[PDB]
């Protein structure tokens, strides 16, 4: 009964009820993430649907999970907010127990185990497909430090060397859009535009992904992460980037 200093492993042994152990629900989201020199940005839409009905329009799907990482989760809304909270506690728990944060590779491995341990529930539709974005301080090069990691339902993880990735119902549209717009990414502001644009494109072709609501003023949420840590992009900066795009499509 080795101690892995894992908060979830602890819960499993003594608090199973707390864990989202698993034996139509709101779903539908598109999350994108890309690498720009010396940085990584990640954004997600705000829609939630049950069948054809819009169940939510303010949903937040991208969360800063520690000073240098964020996670966006697509799939069944229930299962995703819980996953982000749990993962953040797991990360900070190891740090307090061991006085030092996990290496990036360790953080990835830990998330993969949480994912893989949900495959059975995901078969039944309580799916959670996460996207991980982080900046590695330990990495030798700050400019290329940014990291994007995707997970398949069995826990397989890939580190994308392409520089962009997406997950969710509109992810194909978002990825094709970034494929064209990527060369325009040269800093954190261009990269954040391209991200908000890829998400606009996804909302344009997928009814499950909501685009910018100018009537209620709800916009995608984003997080950017560079050597100085992870930060929530302010609504207003996103709203302005949205108008820019809308204005420019007209």
């Amino acid at each position: 009964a080795v101690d892995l200093s894992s908060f979830t492993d602890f819960l499993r042994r003594q608090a199973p009820e707390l864990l989202p152990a698993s034996i139509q629900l709101p779903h539908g989201a598109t999350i994108v993430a890309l690498k720009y020199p010396g940085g990584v940005v990640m954004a997600g839409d705000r829609r939630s649907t049950q069948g054809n009905m819009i169940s939510g329009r303010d949903v937040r799907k991208v969360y800063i999970t520690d000073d240098y990482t964020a996670t966006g989760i697509a799939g069944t809304a229930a299962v995703a907010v819980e996953f982000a909270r749990l993962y953040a506690v797991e990360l900070e728990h190891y740090e307090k127990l061991e006085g030092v944060p996990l290496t990036f590779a360790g953080k990835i491995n830990r998330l993969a185990i949480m994912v893989r341990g949900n495959l059975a529930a995901a078969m039944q539709g309580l799916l959670a497909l996460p996207l991980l974005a982080g900046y590695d301080i330990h990495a030798s090069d700050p400019q290329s430090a940014g990291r994007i990691v995707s997970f398949d339902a069995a826990g397989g993880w890939n580190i994308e060397e392409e520089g962009y990735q997406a997950v969710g119902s509109g992810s194909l549209f978002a990825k094709s859009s970034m494929k064209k717009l990527y060369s325009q990414v040269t800093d954190g502001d261009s990269g954040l535009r391209v991200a908000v644009e890829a998400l606009y494109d996804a909302a344009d072709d997928d009814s499950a992904t909501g685009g910018p609501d100018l009537v209620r003023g709800i916009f995608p949420t984003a997080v950017i992460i560079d050597a100085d840590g992870a930060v929530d992009v302010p609504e207003s900066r996103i709203a302005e980037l949205a108008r820019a795009i809308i204005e420019s499509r007209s």
Binding site: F10, L11, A15, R85, L86, E92, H93, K96, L97, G99
Partner: protein, 220 residues
């Protein structure tokens, strides 16, 4: 027959005091900054002062393997209650109450009791205005609510009085640090000192370790 309780009581109690008395000392005191932790500690890898939760700190004196074991269990209890409810529902009072129950049980049921003495401290949440809380928990599970400072480890009386004479209700961090250092030296340098504080100013994670250059500067 059974065995004598008064006898067991006394011997087990004496054994615990001796281990602690022979141990390095630690002080924790309230300040404008919030709470200050100072302990004499030669080693550079082994902590006696740690973060438990957002605004909750931990300091101990006694046998290391024994209090590091308590520090971990405490972090497990906090993380778990904060997960099952909300971060804001975790309190210093609760962590202390747990340690009491725990040491109380170890004392009564284990082979040897724990040669430890500990302190759980809690500052207010970013923006609130609440007086810092300090608790001391004995090896036997006794628990005390301390208003301004706590002293544990080795020979205390000197250190305690020294502090009783010079305590300031809202000392600047440098001044408070100097006072603490003075009590410790008086009781019995950067290299020999481990320092950290629960900072009210910090928005979420109050705990901060004051090390090397910065410490030296603060010291003088």
């Amino acid at each position: 027959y059974f065995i004598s309780p008064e006898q067991a009581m006394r011997e087990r109690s004496e054994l615990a005091r001796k281990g602690i008395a022979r141990a390095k000392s630690v002080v924790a005191l309230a300040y404008a900054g919030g709470v200050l932790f100072v302990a004499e500690n030669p080693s550079r890898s082994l902590q006696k002062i740690s973060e438990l939760y957002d605004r909750v700190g931990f300091a101990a004196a006694g046998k290391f393997n024994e209090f590091d074991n308590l520090r971990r269990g405490g972090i497990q209890f906090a993380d778990t209650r904060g997960y099952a409810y909300d971060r804001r529902d975790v309190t210093g009072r609760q962590l202390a109450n747990v340690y009491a129950q725990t040491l109380g049980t170890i004392f009564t049921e284990q082979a040897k009791p724990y040669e430890v003495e500990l302190c759980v401290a809690e500052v207010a949440h970013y923006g609130e205005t609440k007086r810092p809380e300090l608790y001391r928990i004995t090896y036997d599970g006794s628990i005390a609510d301390e208003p301004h400072f706590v002293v544990m480890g080795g020979t205390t009386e000197p250190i305690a009085n020294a502090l009783k004479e010079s305590y300031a209700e809202n000392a600047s961090l440098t001044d408070a640090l100097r006072i603490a250092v003075a009590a410790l030296r008086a009781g019995s340098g950067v290299a020999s000192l481990e320092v950290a504080v629960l900072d009210a100013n910090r928005p979420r994670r109050a705990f901060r370790r004051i090390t090397g250059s910065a410490l030296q500067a603060l010291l003088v």
